[PDB]
Amino acid sequence: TISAQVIDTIVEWIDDNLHQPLRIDDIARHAGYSKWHLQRLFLQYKGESLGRYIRERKLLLAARDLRDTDQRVYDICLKYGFDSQQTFTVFTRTFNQPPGAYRKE
């Protein structure tokens, strides 16, 4: 029990939520835990900054949609959180693996 069961709710919010980005103000509210209700968790349970963990989660989620043989490549990053194609093109810094070649795999 950390901050009255915030771990059991963060995962549910990440699962249920739409492609809306996750920031301090966005998740600070209906979360039931403010900035410090999340800082301790991100420091202890995860040990990684939000901008990298969210990007990794989006990449792991899109790894299946890229294999689902979808022709609308521009909408793949949009349906998962990346509001722009250039920002998602994160993939170069993470995998150094072609968008298209991976999409071909």
Added chain:
Amino acid sequence: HYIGDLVQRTEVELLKTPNLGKKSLTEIKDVLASRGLSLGMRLENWPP
């Protein structure tokens, strides 16, 4: 999401969440007091 669920829950545990911008107590009193509903009455059947 129901009026029967809103009238039954006690405000002592309802007003402690920090995510509510405002509970709209004006409309809450308008829907409970003007319709003959006091603090925590058990209705016959609230859910559809």
